[PDB]
Design brief:
The protein is of the alpha+beta class. 25% of the residues lie in helices and 23% in strands. It is built from 13 helices and 27 strands. The chain has helices at 40-50, 63-70, 74-86, 107-114, 185-191, 216-226, 252-266, 281-292, 315-331, 388-391, 457-472, 480-483, 525-532, and strands spanning 3-5, 18-22, 28-35, 90-95, 100-106, 119-122, 128-130, 136-138, 145-149, 158-159, 162-163, 204-209, 233-237, 271-276, 301-304, 306-309, 334-338, 356-357, 365-375, 378-384, 397-398, 426-427, 430-433, 440-444, 447-452, 491-492, 522-523. The relative contact order is 0.15. Bound molecules: calcium ion. Calcium ion is lined by residues 493-495, 510-511, 513, 515, 518, 521. Residues 182-534 form the Peptidase S53 domain.
Length: 534
């Protein structure tokens, strides 16, 4: 019958990608379809509505009631199964609350079902399969499908951490005022006045990982060296991915282990659930929906240190991710994400500034990066993290996908620096120490070293939220609107520096109040808690 284009799936060949022929032989391949769901408008409105309410008197939805009220319908899954069967695909697994389904079949079947021709591509960052053109499905099913992910398997995200390269002191003079010292997460938390007497007991922090793994020896050695009891850590497999260390310190293991060590050191009473998934748009989405809707571990917080330029994703994939973050906000789950570690250009050399996703989502607490100089438990100096082209810098900027939220509009978010300007959601929301030169001591694959990157800030603040949730007795959930309504005295304002590592324009620059390098600044823990208490 007639076919219909599914919006947001158009793709031209990627820059630097080389076509290596059609995918054939017909091995079995899997994709994730995102279905329409019941009462989608009400869901968005409910969250957008609760904004005018302090998170300690709001009404969030419950996981057990969510599927029936806002999940995809069984009638719709039946139609998706009919569509699958009619094209040689199988509906392998349904996720009712999240409103998604995994379908698999030989390439010819996937090609036919979605109106694409999958091709092999070689690229400097890794070979993958993808399509050039658009996705078209039978008109009869088109209304039921909002997105198809996994057709393109290019690595979708980068873990936003960096290993320290320089540790040696100044020749004929060893001083301390910005380096070459390092901190434990506890030292940083003290500088940010995290509320004490709290360890996150009763909370579960979900940590999303798109590669690598952790080993118990590195973790045990780390916590023992701090003289603290280690948190309970469990691994969760998504789409067949598992806890699989590779042994490379600059590989995904570095991210996995720093995430656990930073969050665990500060909220050792929290259960840390680590969700492993493939590094593809489908894997990333499935890791987030699995954690957000997890009936077993029931996380109250999700920490993400992986991401990619918002323009490197298919629009339909970003929309599906954003919907999963809307679910988290509706369910009272806080989602934090590193804002990027490659400055205002986010690792792209096309002559444009780019912000990183998921940080760009209005439903995510975007975490920027600073260089922190602290001593005797106090902040002596805190500036924008910018160590140049090869050293990295905090992500930050103006989204070209998401409009400026009403709750963020009074902050000093500027128009985009790109040609044409234009308003958009400002990145980041808050910031914390991320400079490897004033980094965090960690144990990665058995060795003691120092790391930085905004990848450390998401777990740092995830632990802060866990402590605050413990004190409040109930989860704070979606915090963004609240943060922008709080008095400025709740934050340590960063006013000096810029996150431009591409040119001399000082792209974006810090200043009094909100800026596109550090957002509202570093939270002052005890003040934030006090402001959230009834
Ligand atoms: Ca500022």
């Amino acid at each position: 019958e007639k076919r219909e284009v599914l919006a947001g799936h158009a793709r031209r060949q990627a820059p630097q990608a080389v076509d290596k022929g059609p995918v054939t032989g017909d091995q079995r391949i899997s994709v994730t379809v995102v279905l329409r769901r019941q009462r989608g408008d009400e869901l968005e409105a409910h969250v957008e509505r609760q904004a005018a309410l302090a998170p300690h008197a709001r009404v969030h939805l419950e996981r057990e009631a969510f599927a029936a009220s806002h999940g995809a319908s069984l009638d719709d899954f039946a139609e998706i199964r009919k569509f699958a069967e009619a094209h040689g695909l199988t509906l392998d697994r349904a996720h009712v609350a999240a409103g998604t389904a995994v379908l698999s079949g030989p390439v010819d079947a996937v090609n036919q079902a979605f109106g694409v021709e999958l091709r092999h591509f070689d690229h400097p960052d890794g070979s993958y399969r993808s399509y050039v053109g658009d996705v078209r499905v039978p008109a009869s099913i088109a209304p039921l499908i909002e997105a198809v992910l996994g057709l393109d398997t290019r690595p979708v995200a980068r873990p936003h951490f960096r290993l320290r390269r320089r540790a040696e002191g100044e020749f004929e003079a060893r001083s301390q005022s910005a380096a070459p010292t390092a901190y434990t997460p506890l030292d940083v938390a003290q500088a940010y006045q995290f509320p004490e007497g709290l360890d996150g007991q009763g909370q579960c922090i979900a940590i999303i990982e798109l590669g690598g793994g952790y080993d118990e020896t590195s973790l045990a050695q780390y916590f023992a060296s701090l003289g603290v009891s280690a948190p309970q850590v469990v691994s969760v497999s998504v789409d067949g991915a598992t806890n699989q260390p590779t042994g490379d310190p600059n590989g995904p293991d570095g991210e996995v282990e720093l995430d656990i060590e930073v969050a665990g050191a500060l909220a050792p009473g929290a259960k840390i659930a680590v969700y492993f998934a493939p590094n593809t748009d489908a894997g990333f989405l499935n890791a987030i929906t699995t954690a957000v809707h997890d009936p077993t571990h029931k996380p109250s917080i999700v920490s993400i240190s992986w991401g990619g330029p918002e323009d490197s994703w298919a629009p339909a994939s970003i929309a599906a991710m954003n919907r999963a973050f809307l679910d988290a906000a509706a369910l009272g789950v806080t989602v934090l994400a590193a804002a990027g570690d490659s400055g205002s250009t986010d690792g792209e050399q096309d002559g444009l500034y780019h912000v990183d996703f998921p940080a760009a989502s209005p439903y995510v607490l975007a975490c920027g990066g600073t260089r922190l100089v602290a001593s005797a438990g106090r902040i002596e100096r805190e500036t924008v993290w910018n160590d140049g082209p090869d050293g990295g810098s905090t992500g930050g900027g103006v989204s070209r996908i998401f409009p400026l939220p009403s709750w963020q509009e009074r902050a000093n978010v500027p128009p985009s620096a790109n040609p044409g300007a234009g308003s958009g959601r400002g990145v980041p929301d808050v910031a914390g120490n991320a400079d490897p030169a004033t980094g965090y001591e960690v144990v990665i694959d058995g060795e003691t070293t120092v790391i930085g990157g905004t990848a450390a800030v998401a777990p740092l603040f995830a632990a802060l939220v866990a402590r605050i949730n413990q004190k409040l007795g109930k989860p704070v959930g979606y915090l963004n609107p609240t943060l922008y309504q709080l008095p400025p005295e709740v934050f340590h304002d960063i006013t000096e520096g810029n996150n431009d590592i591409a040119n001399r324009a000082r792209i974006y620059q810090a200043g009094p109040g909100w800026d596109p390098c550090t957002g509202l600044g570093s939270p002052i823990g005890i003040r934030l808690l006090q402001a959230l208490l009834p």
